[PDB]
Amino acid sequence: WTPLEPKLITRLADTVRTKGLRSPITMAEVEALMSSPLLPHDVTNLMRVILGPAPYALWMDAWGVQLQTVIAAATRDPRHPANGQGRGERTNLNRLKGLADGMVGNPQGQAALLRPGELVAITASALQAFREVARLAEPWADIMQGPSESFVDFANRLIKAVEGSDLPPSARAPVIIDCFRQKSQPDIQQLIRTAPSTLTTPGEIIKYVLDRQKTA
Amino acid sequence: WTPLEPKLITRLADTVRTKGLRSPITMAEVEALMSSPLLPHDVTNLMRVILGPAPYALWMDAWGVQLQTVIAAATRDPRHPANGQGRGERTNLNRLKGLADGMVGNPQGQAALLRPGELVAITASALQAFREVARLAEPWADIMQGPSESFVDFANRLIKAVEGSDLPPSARAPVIIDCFRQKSQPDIQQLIRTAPSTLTTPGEIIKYVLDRQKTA
Amino acid sequence: WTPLEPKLITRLADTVRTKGLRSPITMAEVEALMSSPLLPHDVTNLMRVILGPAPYALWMDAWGVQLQTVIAAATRDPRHPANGQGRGERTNLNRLKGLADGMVGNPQGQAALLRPGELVAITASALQAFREVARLAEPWADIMQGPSESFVDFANRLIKAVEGSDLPPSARAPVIIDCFRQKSQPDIQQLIRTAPSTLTTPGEIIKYVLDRQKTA
Amino acid sequence: WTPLEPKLITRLADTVRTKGLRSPITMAEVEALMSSPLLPHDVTNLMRVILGPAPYALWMDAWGVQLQTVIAAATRDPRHPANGQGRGERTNLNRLKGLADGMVGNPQGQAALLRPGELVAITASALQAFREVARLAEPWADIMQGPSESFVDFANRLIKAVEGSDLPPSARAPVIIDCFRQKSQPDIQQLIRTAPSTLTTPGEIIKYVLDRQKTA
Amino acid sequence: WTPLEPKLITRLADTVRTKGLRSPITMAEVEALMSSPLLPHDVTNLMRVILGPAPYALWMDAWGVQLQTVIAAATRDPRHPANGQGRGERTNLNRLKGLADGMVGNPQGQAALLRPGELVAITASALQAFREVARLAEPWADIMQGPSESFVDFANRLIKAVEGSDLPPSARAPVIIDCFRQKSQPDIQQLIRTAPSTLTTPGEIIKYVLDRQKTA
Amino acid sequence: WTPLEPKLITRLADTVRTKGLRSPITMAEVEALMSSPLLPHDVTNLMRVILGPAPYALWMDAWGVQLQTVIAAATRDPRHPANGQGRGERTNLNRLKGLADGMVGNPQGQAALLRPGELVAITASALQAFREVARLAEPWADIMQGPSESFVDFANRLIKAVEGSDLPPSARAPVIIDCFRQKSQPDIQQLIRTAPSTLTTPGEIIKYVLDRQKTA
């Protein structure tokens, strides 16, 4: 086990302190420090340092809930990269939260007994929990493209607000498309309307609009 | 033996000077500089440099107590990674504190005679002693939510004061909940009281209150 | 599998944030972080972090198209470094995009089953897709030297717009020369026209004009 | 072949951006990054990144001219550290500019076939070309000492304009002296005129004037 | 001979400038730069750079005195690691201070003729002289706890003044305890007096007082 | 040959720009970057970068004069560490200033042919020339110890002004002593007057005064 640099952690903590929890730069920095699969000890101490007390409580709750969903999916499929083939490799929440035997407080033993699939599942769970808490602490149908705003900024803002919302995963693309069509002030509205081809994906709409946009 | 960089030690000392002993960034930095197993000379000089005189005295006391607990566990189990199989490898406190023969003041001889299990035990003992002294050096039942204070600030302050107190670990969540219910001025009190669902976690209470709070 | 440093990724993300997608320094930095053959997981997370949402959608599209061209060339030649000799080693797009069995979400298994030729093909495809999206996200024949603008600023702007355009590499110097001659308001036009020597390079024209320019 | 750090290149590019091309700190930094013998690929990409488009064109021109002078000296002496003893080792400009066979676009093959004498000659040529372009990209006989200006500022400005001009090196000191005597408003003119000793160096004149100047 | 880095020397000089001569961090840094056996030239230039003029004079005096004590011990024992077996290897102070023939001003010749025992003796002498001058340049029995001062500040000040004084190392703890008992205004005096347990360490006294102190 | 870091040179240039040429911190920094023996190329470029045009002219003059004094001492003693035993190793000023054959503009050849004694003599000459120019560009008998000034600051200022003046080297110590006795306001005057021992050195006077000074 190798610990994360306290210099990077201090810089990330100050980033969270000045920019907040929800800024795209903060989420990018968290994704950066969430690159290598971390042990429960690492993520727990990281969130202890960068988050205040109340956001840390919220994050512990959300992390537990997401890990429980993961364990339900794991008991629903014996081919989980955290599981094994026999029943003796089934992964309990004590092993995920670092509470199992030989792991409590010891990061070396933790790194010894944990699986790489376990590590990546814990890491993805912690990232999703961070996203939930950030969305909770401090509206996609109210987003309009400003008269002076460019289209890539509007698309970034809209996709951010739609993906970081309460919609099901299978309802984000149609909503993003229909919001591109009805928002995005009438010049781009007519540009999308008069599309000789049928655009059936937000990426394709973005590419088309970026090609044929009125340079100004 | 290779000494730690005085640049890292100076940066850590300034971190302790500005952030304090108990900040999570400071504990992360200490864990960072506590990564490789250190010899008693290294940890002793490190604490001499980063800590003031009175915290250094407290830390010497706490380190001695923790090492004594370790030696009691060692005489309670002949399979300690610091011990050996025969009685001639039993580890005395003079060998742990660096006071044994051939070690006093000489880090090279120290590194020669010491075991890796000895080093990791000394290191873990020093880390626990640092935690104790940090918790000791610098009231939750007196915390009220001010008339103008927001709820996340009140929750942060309350969770901080409850977790940094003398309560057992298994009594913090019920106390935090019952303090959310009885403190947190009567508007939020009635908001929590009339909860159609049963809230059984501080994170869930915080989420509910943040959702249904009176925007003002 | 070893992950890329989040410090390098954070520095690259800030580079993309300040300099943009198309600057030569940004492309050099991407080439730097594109040195070792990356697994689909690595490149996917890298583009997720450094690119915004809409450029990331565009990049996913372009990467898919380039990988499809690669797979067409692969079915057009059984000697692809990603292919094998028999038909059982033919590489499907599920194996290139990391969607095949034993690879979805698991970078360790990914690194296990993938070929080095597969890795380098994926990497080159991702680099070409990044170039396409950068050229798409953000006109030389409309550039005139303003009445008050100096000549070095005009030359900088013109060379920038000509080299960052859709012209072939072998057509940039003649175009830059003929734009120096026809733009660059009639004082400098006559200064270049009455050149006793024949100027056959943009650098030589710039040097001549800087020597004989009307100091004002 | 090992590439130069993009961090050093970014720092050097920002140095060139803020200080300019001609500052002594910039030339020192270039000499620093010009320490190990670089391959044509390295120097070419370095100048592509640190220099703008028009200075890069000028630098390509100057580098070609200096390399041609080097090749003329090489055909004038068969004992060039780039040449060999037989005629089969004669070095063509395609091999110096990296255009020869097995080198175009490939830095590894470049490093394979190139000689150390070739590398140092290319490097010195590139440094001289950079100096020429820096002197070219950015009048002594019009410099007067202002009524309110101090003498050290006037001397600095005059020596700067005289040394950064088209005079031969052996004509700068007499010109600086005779400009000290005829410029430098009549109080200092009479102070230099009535010098009991003969001052035959700009430094001696500066020292004398600083000693006997009218404190005001 | 290899010189010490001017970067390390500049950092050490600024450390001495901000922290002073007597801080434990400064002595640690000096011990760091005093790791390899230095030639008289190195130590002399080092003290010339890091110390001011008057401390440098004091240090020259103290270094001479300590070297004279070393030479007296050397003439009192022919088995000095600087001496040899015959009388022709006896080490004169001109050879220690670098004043002997073939050494004055030349570090290369110095490194040639000097012995490793000579180097380590010179180095230890210089370190002891630095300690003396630091103790000399910039009262524990006069320290009282002010009426408004907290107890941790008083303990810090007292431990600082007692450890940075002329007492033997084995007499600091009893003095600190007996000064806690007789200073530290009568409320804390009575608090320590009525201790049901016997406190036999400054850290234990500090912990007890911090526990049972009158919150105000 | 290894060049000096442009980062250190930039920091030193900014130090000279803000603090000036004569500040003790600037002279300490110059001594730091003057630690290893530099080649004429290094010192020449260093002074070109850190000094303005007029101070650079003055410094070239002073460096030439000091090197000429060195060469006179060298022809006055055939045992110069730059000289050799035979007449064929006599060192000409073209070899010291880097103007000799095989050295003009080439630092590698310079480092090849130069002697270490040559390097240290050039370095000491350049340092003395820098001191002269710094004293010249922007009075010891006017120095008084202020009513509130400490004694070590007064001693530093006085020794600085006396050693950086036009006095012979054999007249500095008596002047420093007699200035300690007559300046240094009457409390310290009487403290030095009533010295039971005879103080015959500035260091001894400083030590005595620091011992018996009135703590306040």
Author numbering:
A (entry chain C), B (entry chain B), C (entry chain D), D (entry chain E), E (entry chain A), F (entry chain F): 11 to 148, 152 to 229
Task: Quote from the publication.
The CA portion of all retroviral Gag proteins folds into two separate domains, the N-terminal domain (CANTD) and C-terminal domain (CACTD). In mature lattices, CANTD interactions form only intra-hexamer and intra-pentamer interfaces, while CACTD interactions are also involved in formation of inter-hexamer and inter-pentamer interfaces. Our results show that, like lentiviruses, RSV is sensitive to IP6 in vitro and in cells, where in the mature CA lattice IP6 binds in a pore formed in the center of the CANTD hexamer.
These structures and models indeed confirmed that the mature polyhedron CA lattice consists of structurally different, intrinsically flexible CA hexamers that strongly deviate from regular sixfold symmetry. Aside from the C2-symmetric hexamers that are also observed in regular tubes (and are surrounded by only hexamers, Fig. 3b group V), a fraction of hexamers in the polyhedrons were surrounded by either two or three pentamers in a symmetrical manner and hence followed C2 symmetry and C3 symmetry, respectively. As the structure of the tube-like hexamer with C2 symmetry was already solved at high resolution from regular tubes, it was not further characterized. In contrast, the structures of the other two-symmetric hexamers highlight the structurally dominant influence of the pentamer, where it actively defines the conformation of its adjacent hexamers. Specifically, the two CA monomers facing a pentamer adopt an arrangement similar to those two CA monomers in the pentamer, causing an increased spatial separation between the CANTD’s of the hexamer.
